[PDB]
Amino acid sequence: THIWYFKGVPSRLGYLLDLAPKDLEKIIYFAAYVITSVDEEMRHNELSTLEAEMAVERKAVEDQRDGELEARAQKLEADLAELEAEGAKADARRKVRDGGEREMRQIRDRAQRELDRLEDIWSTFTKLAPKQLIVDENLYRELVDRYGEYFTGAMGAESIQKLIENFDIDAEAESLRDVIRNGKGQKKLRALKRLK
Amino acid sequence: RVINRNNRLKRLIDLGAPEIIVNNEKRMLQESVDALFDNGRRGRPVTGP
Amino acid sequence: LDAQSPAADLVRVYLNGIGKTALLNAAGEVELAKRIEAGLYAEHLLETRKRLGENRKRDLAAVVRDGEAARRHLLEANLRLVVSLAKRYTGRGMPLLDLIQEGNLGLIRAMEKFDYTKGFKFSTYATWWIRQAITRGMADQS
């Protein structure tokens, strides 16, 4: 990218693309991904089935975690009953109980975190729009391996070229003009500046 | 300074380099060209001895 | 939005990008060297002997995927030491951000010629090439 048209304030690249200068600095130097295009109709139609698959995954992980925790609780109760049978120290029994409770809380929170990741993936996919960012590379690669055939992501000046060649100048200009028609002053100044 | 890095990228593309290093070198090449067109426009300017 | 960032670090940014990668144990190199060598032999057989078995096709694809993952999974830890190797030759008028790229070039050059299952040490073997490569690059500016 030519240095002048993205650094000198006002950065005309930012005004053209409606992107914050910090965002442009990040995307240019390969620090974040951006979306080039999305097949909105295809994802809109496939939302039902994809929700079904996400729910299947969620119920599978929940069932596995619940069964594993139930088995651990049963073995822990058996251990405590054996401690009662062996007549050991009551405080040592409470130490064993506290350790088992710590293990259970740890494992249940691990499953909670994993389901949080699982739902965050869906949340990110649901509202996908062009000119967004995904800083976390783990999140981006997960989105890739899940729905590569449902979105297009890129990084660097190639993404900028892709965005530019998909630009309908006249439609955006007239949209800005009609926004200028309304008297919303705070938005009117931004509309005028971008129109310029 | 520009031509060195352009040739290194040309050499790394056809050797099947991993993604991280080619990304780093592309960033470096972009910074080098930016220094070429206008030095001192960003961060620490390039300076000779 | 008239936003700006300090951007006083770049090499720190790269090392942040690769810093989450864990280190490798003493004999962790062979675990993946065996996989990559088996994958190379498998792909040679595929390019020579083909259409022999349908299950063999999926098995060979799987082992090639294993070899590729191995090639990707033994490179990350070495950057935390290539940066240190480069830092020993800083201040000579050439940015260490320049040194790191040729250091990685030497790294791949050494890794592709590691050994044939022969007992050795990966780290010193890599350094044997990295030092000479970066010093050659530094001298090349003369």
Swiss-Prot record, chain B:
Expression induction: 6-fold repressed by starvation.
Family listed: Belongs to the RNA polymerase beta' chain family.
Function recorded in the entry: DNA-dependent RNA polymerase catalyzes the transcription of DNA into RNA using the four ribonucleoside triphosphates as substrates.
Subunit structure: The RNAP catalytic core consists of 2 alpha, 1 beta, 1 beta' and 1 omega subunit. When a sigma factor is associated with the core the holoenzyme is formed, which can initiate transcription.
The name this protein goes by in its record: DNA-directed RNA polymerase subunit beta'
Species: Mycobacterium tuberculosis (strain ATCC 25618 / H37Rv)
Span within the parent record: 346 to 394 of 1316
UniProtKB/Swiss-Prot annotation, chain C:
Region of interest: Sufficient to interact with RbpA: 1-142
Keywords assigned by UniProt, alphabetized: DNA-binding, Sigma factor, Stress response, Transcription, Transcription regulation
GO biological process entries: DNA-templated transcription initiation
Motif, Polymerase core binding: chain positions: 98-101
Region (Sigma-70 factor domain-2): 74-142
Chain residue ranges for the region called Sigma-70 factor domain-1: 9-43
A GO term for molecular function: DNA binding
Subunit structure and binding partners: Monomer. Interacts transiently with the RNA polymerase catalytic core formed by RpoA, RpoB, RpoC and RpoZ (2 alpha, 1 beta, 1 beta' and 1 omega subunit) to form the RNA polymerase holoenzyme that can initiate transcription.
Function: Sigma factors are initiation factors that promote the attachment of RNA polymerase to specific initiation sites and are then released. A non-essential principal sigma factor that responds to cell envelope stress and hypoxia.
Family: Belongs to the sigma-70 factor family.
Written domain comment of the UniProt record: The sigma-70 factor domain-2 mediates sequence-specific interaction with the -10 element in promoter DNA, and plays an important role in melting the double-stranded DNA and the formation of the transcription bubble. The sigma-70 factor domain-2 mediates interaction with the RNA polymerase subunits RpoB and RpoC. The sigma-70 factor domain-4 contains a helix-turn-helix (H-T-H) motif that mediates interaction with the -35 element in promoter DNA. The domain also mediates interaction with the RNA polymerase subunit RpoA.
Full protein name: RNA polymerase sigma factor SigB
Organism ancestry: Bacteria, Bacillati, Actinomycetota, Actinomycetes, Mycobacteriales
Name of the gene encoding the protein in the UniProt record: sigB
Full protein segment contained here: 17 to 158 of 323
